[PDB]
Ligand binder design. Sequence first.
Ligand SMILES: [Mn+2]
Ligand SMILES: [Mn+2]
Ligand SMILES: [Mn+2]
Ligand SMILES: [Mn+2]
Ligand SMILES: [Mn+2]
Ligand SMILES: [Mn+2]
Ligand SMILES: [Mn+2]
Ligand SMILES: [Mn+2]
Ligand SMILES: [Mn+2]
Ligand SMILES: [Mn+2]
Ligand SMILES: [Mn+2]
Ligand SMILES: [Mn+2]
Ligand SMILES: [Mn+2]
Ligand SMILES: [Mn+2]
Lengths: 191, 191, 191, 191, 191, 191
Amino acid sequence: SRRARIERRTRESDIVIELDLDGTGQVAVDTGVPFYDHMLTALGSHASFDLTVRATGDVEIEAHHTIEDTAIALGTALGQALGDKRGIRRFGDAFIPMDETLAHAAVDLSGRPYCVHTGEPDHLQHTTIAGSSVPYHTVINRHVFESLAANARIALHVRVLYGRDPHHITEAQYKAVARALRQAVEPDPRV
Amino acid sequence: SRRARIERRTRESDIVIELDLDGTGQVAVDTGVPFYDHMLTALGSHASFDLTVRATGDVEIEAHHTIEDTAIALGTALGQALGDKRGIRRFGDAFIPMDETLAHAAVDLSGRPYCVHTGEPDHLQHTTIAGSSVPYHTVINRHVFESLAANARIALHVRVLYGRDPHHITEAQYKAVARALRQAVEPDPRV
Amino acid sequence: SRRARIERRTRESDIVIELDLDGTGQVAVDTGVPFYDHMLTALGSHASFDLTVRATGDVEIEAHHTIEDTAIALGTALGQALGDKRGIRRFGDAFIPMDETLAHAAVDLSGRPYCVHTGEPDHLQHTTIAGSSVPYHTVINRHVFESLAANARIALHVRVLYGRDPHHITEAQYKAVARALRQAVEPDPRV
Amino acid sequence: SRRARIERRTRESDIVIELDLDGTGQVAVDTGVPFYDHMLTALGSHASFDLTVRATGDVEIEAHHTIEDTAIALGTALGQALGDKRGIRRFGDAFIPMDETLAHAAVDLSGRPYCVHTGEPDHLQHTTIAGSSVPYHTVINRHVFESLAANARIALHVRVLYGRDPHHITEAQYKAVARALRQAVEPDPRV
Amino acid sequence: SRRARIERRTRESDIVIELDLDGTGQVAVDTGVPFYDHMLTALGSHASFDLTVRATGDVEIEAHHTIEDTAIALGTALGQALGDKRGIRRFGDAFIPMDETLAHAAVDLSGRPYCVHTGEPDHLQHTTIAGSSVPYHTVINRHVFESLAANARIALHVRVLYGRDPHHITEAQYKAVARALRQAVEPDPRV
Amino acid sequence: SRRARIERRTRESDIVIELDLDGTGQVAVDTGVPFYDHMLTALGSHASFDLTVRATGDVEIEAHHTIEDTAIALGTALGQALGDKRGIRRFGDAFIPMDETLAHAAVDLSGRPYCVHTGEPDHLQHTTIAGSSVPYHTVINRHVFESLAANARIALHVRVLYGRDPHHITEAQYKAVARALRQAVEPDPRV
Ligand SMILES: [Mn+2]
Ligand SMILES: [Mn+2]
Ligand SMILES: [Mn+2]
Ligand SMILES: [Mn+2]
Ligand SMILES: [Mn+2]
Ligand SMILES: [Mn+2]
Ligand SMILES: [Mn+2]
Ligand SMILES: [Mn+2]
Ligand SMILES: [Mn+2]
Ligand SMILES: [Mn+2]
Ligand SMILES: [Mn+2]
Ligand SMILES: [Mn+2]
Ligand SMILES: [Mn+2]
Ligand SMILES: [Mn+2]
């Protein structure tokens, strides 16, 4: 049983995470930031987690605090669910082609906490993905990966090899992290 | 007693400031611009002021006029509360690390009115921080510091040594100004 | 059963493809272009397909039309054999070292049709691989990958990281596509 | 009482740390790496900690594992001794001139875990400080700061403004971290 | 049974290797060069080999001859244990994130003997990793990979994508080779 | 009692210094060089010294000899008044904003004698500040700092971060040294 429930209540937000590493992609995410819900739904589904995320926070300011608190809580849940990390593959990686974009992620689950994020085009440091609700500033992508790695206590390297569309570039990164995690958490039949 | 109440009524906005320099961080800010409320709440709290800001203005146009009128009124309140500036430290400075960002501010409270703002990455001249309410254009950060210094009649130098996230970069600057002010307004036991 | 038979008759060529995704590498290719037969034999074998290709076309002009019609028909066969794509790994990738050459391919089988081909040395835009029969112009490599992706309706990214010999560079790419496809078409035990 | 005892036993090393934040610089360090003992003795003394470090590890390989495990354990001890961090200055910074070298550090003790290390001359990525015992490779300086910040859960920025001698450059950084920590952990009379 | 015992006696060194490809990571390495023992212990463990290495050589000169003779003997053992290479995956690759470092290796076990080693920072051509025993000059890393590939008769490509610490950079490469070998030697259920 | 009286009689000048480190800024300076009197009055006042300087020298030549002899004598007085330097803060630093100029100084009072002076605009190597009396050549600023550090036996680093006006640039440096000294000489309540 590799499950964790994390509640995180801060001045800025209130987060509940329920995570099972050995899931079938039963995922429900509601953070008040719909593009971020899309990304975390992709992360949970492609990782073959079962994942519920419920977050409410100070989106009148902008999505940053809620996004960051959610990534800290999710990181914490992943570290807790992994437990002693005995008998797992430990390392995982995945390439995600998405139209013109190619992204990659590599993880070491028993590595020191560390994040390296490279290759994202410079326009993503000031791009907004905006719909009818609270928008998503792509400059936060790096912050999400850094917060996940710091709180799960894993080494997580995310690369954009190339790409143009900010939705493709962002979604391919979340999916690459997800499939890298899926590989790394699997039981290793030789260990 | 180092207190000031400033009312500023213009064509564009209506501002009330109540400031006490010798506070404990009892801060309440409501300007209709929630990211700016976040920044001024950080400024008042980290300066160990007691500070109430109530502003209403022409946010149908954008936040600029309300932000500027608020910074003019706050500047005026700080100059008035300082009075003759006798027996204070006068100079103050502070570094604020915020994740990848490092900011600094230095003040001379008995200096000629002057603002120098350096180091902010070029992407902040066209970045928007957007939530569910009125957004905040980071190009205004310099205008806020310039308006505070011009109306408090102080020398205020704000630097970004490095950083990436526009929320970190902006918040670290407001906090650095706040902690520089906190040091400078303190009684000097030798003067 | 993941099988397809495609017949494609054009003004330029006549193609029959029989494909089984769940094969053991029983491959027979005869297109009149022997280097291309070598490449498609490598593709079918390394993908663990069972694959028969029979093509005749206007090789008095040059191999282009036959190569392109063959890749369109093969693409079509792969899309048809995949069917609804339920319960498969969907993503796959492979590195192929071949002496001095390193190539890579990544696929998303449920991705929009898209091909990105990068890294091939500039000399391959005007190189000929020539024997005793119809020669193979390596400039067509990109066209083969583009035609496969457009007609299978998959995302296919092919990279040459480095290399020198045009036969190594071309063969490593065909093998990398093959092993990426082999991984992606496999049943996924968790989906 | 702001004290912590951390025991850390790994495959590579065995570490005992006893730390008191409210000390008078009573410091005893023995790691088997005498230049590192010099640096941690400087850190504990200039921070006005009371600090005992006893470490034994696989120095037949080189100092890296012992240095890293020691910095992880020390980081952990500092986080534990800080407790809820109520009523402290929280931010601290210090400049350390050492002959030709000027270094600086800035800390936020209630900041997310983060380390930024800048300005160290490129020759320190391959410099050895060697005596009659186990030598110290200055490339590890960054690793020590990163491990301290990750495990104390603080924001720590270390800068070399300029310098030449690798012993001055390294010692000035350790002292700057120490005096920044000393300022940040102090009770804040207004908070 | 995929086992080999190689004895190699030269003017410079005396080497005994016992290798089983189908192991559980039971590894014991003693070459007189403790950092190299660390690296080969990592290689054997991460490859899920059972591996004993006993080497004595002319370390009064430096580690080079012993390191090279050990890598030649280990290469020879891997080629012998692989036998006819029937029914194996043949290709393997692995990414290894290690703090700031990312390394990769790709292998073709039925490829011509060939080694390509790219991306290692220039400082590793003159870096020493030194403890209390015989030191390890990182310039030899390339020689180890070249000697393994030449004597196992495999294609081995090792890349450093980025990194700074010479111990991380070296260890990540040895681990990447190890996990690439582990994948490539595995029985292939379709071949 | 931290007081010193230094008399220095040379071929070029006759200097009397009376210094008390624990003063209230009772300062009287008369060197025959009125801009230098302004600078030393600023230094003594901002350091919270009590300081009398009386110097007469060969100003028919230019101010250099008198300025240098005065700085040597003042340095000597500061070293003597500091005595054994027991129980003091030892390190100090200060930023001084002066209109467009920002200067900084950092000191180690128990450091080896050393001066590093950086950042002063190139026009100050040939600028004169001229009134109705003996003028002041700003090229001497570095010489004053070097002479103070050499004779007080302290490490003194003075930086101009930016500036334009030679009077602002010079005065901000003297004030920064003064406030850095004020911090460093203070009793340290923990040492
Ligand atoms: Mn943040
Ligand atoms: Mn989408
Ligand atoms: Mn305006
Ligand atoms: Mn914030
Ligand atoms: Mn065509
Ligand atoms: Mn790659
Ligand atoms: Mn061939
Ligand atoms: Mn390490
Ligand atoms: Mn600075
Ligand atoms: Mn020393
Ligand atoms: Mn050799
Ligand atoms: Mn190691
Ligand atoms: Mn002179
Ligand atoms: Mn003046």
